[model samples]
Target chain A: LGLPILLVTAAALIDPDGRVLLAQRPPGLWEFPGGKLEPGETPEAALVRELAEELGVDTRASCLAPLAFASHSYDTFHLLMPLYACRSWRGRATAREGQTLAWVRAERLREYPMPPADLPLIPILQDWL
Target chain B: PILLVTAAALIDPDGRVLLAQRPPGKSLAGLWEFPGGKLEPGETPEAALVRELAEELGVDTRASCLAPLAFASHSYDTFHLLMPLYACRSWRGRATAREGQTLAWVRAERLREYPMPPADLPLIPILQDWL
Candidate 1:
């Protein structure tokens, strides 16, 4: 079997003060809240499900806004992802998945190390908010 | 609260519009819908769509590239939905389902075969006429 093309969805939940939320994966690299889509899940649905699982926040598909996307070829497999922006979620976001969570300003996203596919989305997201 | 949602009809060279199947267990599951989601607070519709296209289809689309096509206003049981539908022909990458949903590109004349939300029905002819 060859490397499969992974379809992923991510969310950039911005706070009232315009800070974007990021998650520190186990490897210590910072990235948005997202994951591979479960079978039969829509991108919007997947993001909502992922946020709830990873951050312990409640969000509906209607609250997720499509922002930008990333397409990069990794050594193991190719990654294609859509990034959404959510400003209104039901609960205070907590890192329930054993990863650290940080609310960083748009300007400072570059200072943190993100997965290569997530890097290009920073400028697009920064300019949007 | 009035929900602000944005959706897009991706037109390929063949003039077919791309639709995504709503997953089982979700509201309106098994129905097809144009790809999009709600606008976050303070985020404009176009900005929100730009994000959605990337996240949903892995297509990088810009606000300027999106054309205002139609809108739908419907009252659901919980809240009123105000959705602005857009049309796009240019994007950075091919459309792919990144979120486990199935995708199909359907011609305008056959859009009726796919069960969509009540609000989305009226927009079909509008898209068919435009395409």
Candidate 2:
């Protein structure tokens, strides 16, 4: 069987001041607000949806721009990640899901322990911010 | 015109895939649809559904698990309805319609009886296969 390729979208919402929105994973320790892409859904559509579900806020698509993409194969799953940078939306930042969120500068994310697969994208994530 | 996004989920033990009725005065007013809304400017289709579900349905779902269903397109007065499909086998919380409209668990196969938007008719068959 073809590796069950899982299409996921990772969204990085940044403020004008340079802080990017990051989410603490559930049942694990990592930072990023993203997940697999559903059928018939575009990358943009998924990004807007994922943000609200994870972070309790209403963000408009206009505030986002394509940042980078990463395709990593894990022992159990294959992840196709596309990261977007959003700059504007409507509402205060709050955690709607149980996941914790933080506004860390992209340059400083190196300090946090993230999924091993996500390490390669750190520079790309930081460069866009 | 509203951009259409497809969003669905495997029926829970209760046999419901979160439903929402179009608000009055809006396109397809009073019609029921799988919980989802329009895509934002830069966000992807799946992301839009996640956000819309939270705003319209008031449930928290695993964004990573949104399975791709299919795509549908319809035209509204001001925007083009681009509907992207997504399915989740699991989620947290009972389906809640906070939009102040009537909500129900019309069996997936029997969704035809409900007054849904013309664009949503094409989605029925797609939903059946998953059910």
Candidate 3:
């Protein structure tokens, strides 16, 4: 059997006032801003960099620790995600990359339409956040 | 040029936004601005800001309260730096220089005195609204 490509994804936990961050995907769906982890990069590093590229923020790695992880099987690939959290930083958040961004209370995440894979994180985050 | 989307928060205790200046020789050195950096491969700007505050400034904050403010974009040789501004009213720990640079707690109205990058200029008005 051909080895399944393992795609590792990471996310940041940012709450300006105990609210979680969410973004509308470019293709038109709501999900936390994250993508496939790059080679030679730790999950935290990848998450840190991806957040900035997509949302316009420079985040620290040390503050990012694993919050929740998910393994999903998509039609094209296998995905694994490790979510991290951070509440404080030095800038404001904006949708600089064309994708829309929103800040919601952690418990209110259910109100938004999120990727099925990311849905599992809501409850997990409810407990953690 | 690769576009770097970065986000920062205008954290305040009572109408003051947090600011940081990169030291000499650093990229965008000596420019007074908010604290933040490039988002990692699989993370969002909100997440990056939390990590940034902890790693770059040594503060622990709840990511939930970071309110969205505005956006800015700057093109570089290798990347286009896109910045988003967030606002945080409370967090834990005293702000420290986690990155060994100068830090400031400035009122939004006084931002004109700081030498910020041209891209960040648009965000000034947004900050004023929060006050």
Q: Which candidate should be chosen as best, given DockQ against the real structure?
A: 3
Docking class of 1: incorrect
lDDT per residue (tens digit) for residues B1-131 in model 1: 34657899899888889999988879888889999997664455677789998998899989778766656555678765656678899889989899888999998888989999887776787677667
Report residue A103 deviation for candidate 3 (angstroms).
26
lDDT of 3 by residue, A1-129 (tens): 112434455564567578888888676467877677665565556777887777777777666644555545566544545566776555577787888788888777889997787776677677666
Q: What is the TM-score of chain B in candidate 1?
A: 0.96
Candidate 2 or 3, higher lDDT?
Answer: 3
Q: Rank the candidates by TM-score, best first.
A: 1, 3, 2
Candidate 3 CAPRI level:
incorrect
User: Ten consecutive residues with minimal summed lDDT in candidate 3 chain A?
Assistant: A1-10
Please identify which of the two predictions, 1 or 3, would achieve the higher lDDT against the true structure.
Answer: 1
What CAPRI-style quality would you assign to candidate 2? incorrect
For each candidate, give the interface RMSD after superposing the true interface residues on Cα.
14.2, 13.0, 13.4
Question: RMSD of each candidate?
Answer: 12.8, 16.5, 13.8
Candidate 1 lDDT over A34-104, as tens digits, reads 99877545567778888998888998888876555565556676565667779899989988888889999
TM-score to true structure, per model: 0.51, 0.48, 0.50
lDDT of 2 by residue, A20-111 (tens): 87778766466678776676566667778878777766776656555555545555555656566687877767888777778888778988
Better of 1 and 3 by DockQ: 3
